[PDB]
């Protein structure tokens, strides 16, 4: 039924492997291309990666590379074409390094494709992560590219080594950057791994699972029960709301979760009643002090007013405002003990 994995498998199956000869030739053609770019940088006085990408623009497709980097990366007619024209002004010795360059550029692609059959075989022991087959393999191939650009054939080492070391990394990074729904930075993943590792070891030995005492003991210095327990708490991942229930296939999870982040119908009339009855009990105070109170507690502009400010527009000193709101407060305290209307709202 159109398997996505067999697609890629037979797609890499079309391009054959590479023996010693082809490999060395490839790498050499690549480094030759790159150093060619290095001289071509001195040619027109440009950068490495600049001309290097300009080469790509003419090789792995023309309009398509500059068309969808996303809405803004670099202009095609402006910062690209002028680079083509500017390097067209050069003689034999110069102009040939261009062809050398692009040749090496193709050699890089051939190299990556030839060794892809490895990267696919690398992510197979790496399954069971927070990512599936293709998702893993691709992020491994991303490591294959960097494994290519940094490789040196002069060291007489088979590329299958230097590549594999970069794949084994790229995947183990790919898990650290995806994994759990919540994002966990590298170091945390590391420490967690060490913890579970220790667990697996002393549980294999002792014939039973450890305690936060012994597991942190075996973890070395600075490791106590509280810390291992802490990182253990962070270790767990969120639970899906689509989680089924018991024997009933119909029963979901999230339908059991209440909304407390929105005011309950009772709370609406509650806050209303408070804001009303308070305004009623406020009218028994002097025109100044009553205003000063709601200016102080932010029932006016929604913000607290320092004694300095309440006194600034009233002309009175801060001390005056202070005594005013104290007095007014207790003058309210007289009526409240009587009516017992607002003696509620005590939480």
């Amino acid at each position: 039924t159109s398997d996505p994995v067999r697609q890629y498998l037979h797609e890499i199956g079309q391009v054959p492997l590479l023996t010693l000869e082809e490999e060395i030739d490839l790498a050499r053609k690549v480094e030759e291309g790159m150093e060619a770019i290095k001289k071509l940088s001195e040619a027109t006085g440009l950068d490495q990666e600049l001309i290097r990408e300009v080469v790509r623009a003419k090789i792995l497709g023309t309009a398509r590379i500059q068309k969808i980097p996303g809405l803004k990366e670099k202009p095609d007619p402006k910062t690209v074409e002028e680079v083509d024209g500017k390097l067209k002004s050069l003689p034999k010795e110069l102009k040939r390094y261009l062809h050398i360059a692009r040749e090496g550029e193709a050699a890089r692609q051939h190299l990556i494709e030839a060794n892809l059959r490895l990267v696919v075989s690398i992510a197979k022991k790496y399954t069971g992560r927070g990512l599936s087959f293709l998702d893993l393999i691709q992020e491994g191939n991303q490591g294959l590219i960097r494994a290519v650009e940094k490789f040196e054939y002069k060291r007489r080492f088979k590329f299958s080594t230097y590549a594999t070391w970069w794949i084994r990394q790229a995947i183990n990074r790919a898990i650290a950057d995806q994994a759990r729904t919540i994002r966990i930075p590298v170091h945390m993943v590391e420490t967690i791994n060490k913890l579970s590792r220790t667990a697996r070891q002393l549980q294999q030995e002792l014939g039973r699972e450890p305690s936060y005492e012994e597991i942190a003991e075996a973890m070395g210095p600075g490791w106590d029960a509280k810390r291992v327990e802490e990182t253990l708490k962070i270790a767990q991942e969120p639970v899906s709301l689509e989680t089924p229930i018991g024997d009933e296939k119909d029963s979901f999870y999230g339908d059991f979760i209440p909304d407390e982040n929105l005011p309950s119908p009772v709370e609406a009339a509650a806050q209303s009643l408070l804001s009303e009855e308070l305004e009623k009990a406020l009218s028994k105070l002097s025109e100044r002090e009553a205003m000063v109170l709601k200016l102080r507690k932010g029932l006016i502009d929604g913000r607290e007013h320092t004694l300095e400010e309440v006194g600034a527009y009233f002309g009175v000193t801060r001390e005056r405002i202070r005594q005013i709101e104290n007095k007014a407060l207790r003058k309210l305290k007289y009526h409240e003990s009587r009516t017992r209307k607002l003696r509620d709202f005590l939480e």
């Binding site: 003419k58 003689p91 034999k92 040939r96 261009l98 062809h99 050398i100 692009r102 040749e103």
Partner: protein, 56 residues
Amino acid sequence: KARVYPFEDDVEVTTGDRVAPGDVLADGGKVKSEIYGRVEVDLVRNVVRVVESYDI
């Protein structure tokens, strides 16, 4: 399957351009490859050939 067009002084074309029946190839319009296809510039063998291809 292709058609060879050896050159002498440089070229106006690069590997991966397309083609046309008698368009300038190399050496100020010395040779013109007449055919449809992909163009390959070879410094070693000092030739710029074209393998027969439509640009579909």
